[PDB]
Structure 1
Amino acid sequence: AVDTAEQVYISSLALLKMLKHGRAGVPMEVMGLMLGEFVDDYTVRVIDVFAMPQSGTGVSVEAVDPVFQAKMLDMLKQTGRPEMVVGWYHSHPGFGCWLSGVDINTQQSFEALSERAVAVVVDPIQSVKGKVV
């Protein structure tokens, strides 16, 4: 569609939270939310990552508990930095990391809240030392 320059910033804690939580629950796609700040049109700056709790024992299924939202963001308000949610993540642990049908399913419902809330995919398997990915 109408595009802009494509640029995503990071935090250094983010990548570590991504790999740890995507490794500890590896054979099932583990939901996690992503937290940061929309600075402008074309750069997005994630600064914080908290993982989502799990549920029933099935691949790729995802949920956003709003009381978890309220209580987690409340704790981050009494923590030094409260900021705006910027998207979410999960893994595609055995493959070349494309968003699945459930992924685009939660994306068309999640896109009505934020425009450039970017979906991110960590993979703790196809990276060894010289890949993030």
Structure 2
Amino acid sequence: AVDTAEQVYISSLALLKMLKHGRAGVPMEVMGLMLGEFVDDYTVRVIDVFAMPQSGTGVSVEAVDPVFQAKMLDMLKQTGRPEMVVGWYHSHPGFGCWLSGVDINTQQSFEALSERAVAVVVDPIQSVKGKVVIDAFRLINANMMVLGHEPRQTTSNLGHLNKPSIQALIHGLNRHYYSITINYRKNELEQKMLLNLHKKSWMEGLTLQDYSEHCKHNESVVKEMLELAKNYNKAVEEEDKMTPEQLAIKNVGKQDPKRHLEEHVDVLMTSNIVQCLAAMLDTVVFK
């Protein structure tokens, strides 16, 4: 009879499949059912996710014949892990990452089966390379406002570690439901696998590109560096006596010396010393 300091675990494959299926149906809302378990009364783990055939309108997306869902959850018992359907997710492209009027409609139906039912909202438009926008919502009773929804016996899910947004606070947020804090659990088998999918084998490490293209590239960079330094001379020698507070206001046009020099220093040095070092490695390793 208490909603404690809850937490949701999501696996790596679940998030990757989540974002791929959200992007694959970019202009409308795609659907999905989550696979997981209730590890304890405190936290809920999602270990897998899967998608179904749908039928989408301009503003709505419905399911199809659910013999797919029953037979799929029957067949997934046979290979490996026989979990349950702990929640459902959809997508909200370009929207406020919030539960809408009809989104909250089926949340009652999903909550009527099991109490610990979690909705997940992902968005592939506002998500960028370094951070995917994600949220998990739990429907609260709209009949009980006078009491407390979660006692907050500690300070985990609060202004701690996350802040409520503005657009979520418009369409609902702490009204009619609430949010829960997501953390990612990583097992060692996938932990020491995920950090190595960018490298190459030894032919990439020991390979001189070519010397003709390297000479022509250095010739081109030095050739443009000539005119760039010639512009830099006039840029330094003018330096009109009037405080950069406006010299940064006459710089906002097409003017470019003092700024492209050190970039050319970097691309010259980090492409020459690497090639010379690799040439030495190739000429005395093999012998």
RMSD: 1.7
Contact 1:27 1:93 in 2 (8 A): yes
Instruction: State the secondary structure of the residue aligned to 2:63.
Output: coil
CA–CA distance in structure 1, aligned partners of residues 9 and 96 of structure 2:
22
CA–CA distance in structure 2, aligned partners of residues 73 and 24 of structure 1:
23
Give the alignment's TM-score, normalised by structure 1.
Answer: 0.91
Higher relative contact order (CA 8 A, sep 6+): 1
After superposition, the Cα gap between the structure-2 partners of 1:112 and 1:64, relative to the gap in structure 1 and judged at 3 Å, is farther
CA–CA distance in structure 1, aligned partners of residues 11 and 38 of structure 2:
14
How many residues were matched structurally?
133
- Cα shift at 1:51: 0.9
- Cα shift at 1:64: 6.8
Instruction: State the secondary structure of the residue aligned to 1:103.
Output: coil
After superposition, the Cα gap between the structure-2 partners of 1:56 and 1:91, relative to the gap in structure 1 and judged at 3 Å, is closer
Contact 2:54 2:61 in 1 (8 A): no
Instruction: State the secondary structure of the residue aligned to 2:62.
Output: coil
- Cα shift at 1:104: 0.3
- Partner of 1:118 in structure 2? 118
Bigger helix share:
2
Instruction: State the secondary structure of the residue aligned to 1:76.
Output: helix
Instruction: State the secondary structure of the residue aligned to 1:49.
Output: strand
Give the alignment's TM-score, normalised by structure 2.
Answer: 0.44
Contact 2:33 2:89 in 1 (8 A): yes
- Cα shift at 1:69: 2.1
Identity of aligned residues (%): 100
- Cα shift at 1:61: 2.5
Q: Which has the larger radius of gyration?
A: 2
Structure 1 residues without counterparts, runs of 5 or longer: none
Bigger strand share:
1
Contact 2:88 2:120 in 1 (8 A): yes
Contact 2:32 2:90 in 1 (8 A): yes
Structure 2 residues without counterparts, runs of 5 or longer: 134-287
57-66 vs 114-123, which moves further = 57-66
